[PDB]
Amino acid sequence: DNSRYTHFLTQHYDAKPQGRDDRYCEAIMRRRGLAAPCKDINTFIHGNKRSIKAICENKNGNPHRENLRISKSSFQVTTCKLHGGAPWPPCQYRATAGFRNVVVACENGLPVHLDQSIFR
Template sequence: MMVLQKIHSLILVSLLTMLGLGLVQLSYGQNAMYQRFLRQHVDPSNRGGTNSYCDSTMRSRGMTTSTCKNVNTFIHESIQKIKNICNTPKVRCKNGRMNCHRGQARVTDCNKTGGSPPNCRYRARGSTRRIVIACSGNPKVPVHFDK
């Protein structure tokens, strides 16, 4: 019994030491940001590009509940293609951090034109253009749409 307690104590001390050194990553925060990124920005099954697409998708994704989100971009690519952007060279994000990456994607940009929650109205602009996303974790996953 005493040996078992010593082993548990040693394992606990080792784990806490690795956490303190940053060798073990707690992934809950990263996973929550990744899930939010998917909800707000990824729609591979649709080509988007219309005002009604923006109106209905912004509503169904919860971005018009209490306020109308002014601007949002939906990426119409597979999540694997979006994750691959995280493997491109790092570029500076708008906030100055160096965890952004650039890639090409089909997108729909939605810009608020009026209405009030939950019936916000948007103008859509579909295009294929360069996007910049912030990535985090190991392996890297997208966590923020920068531009």
């Protein structure tokens, strides 16, 4: 039942952004249904779905600490940090774009969970 891989996709994947700023985060967080109530922190990965799917293999992946997997290649990622202590909307965010490895959990060769803690 790959409905957790799709869920991952929805939360932590945006192929080809363009904008990667406040305006971006503030919009995408709402569109992906994470802005009611507002998620304190969330990161999106950009580029190939292939590259991310390949973290579960040894093609682009290693085993990480406690039954996780870390990418070999670094990814173009954008971290949306919620501004203010407001649990409910408006959700205003500060974007943090970067290039770095990603750590996920794979089930049936598909990533389902993204270790958010590594960002902040």
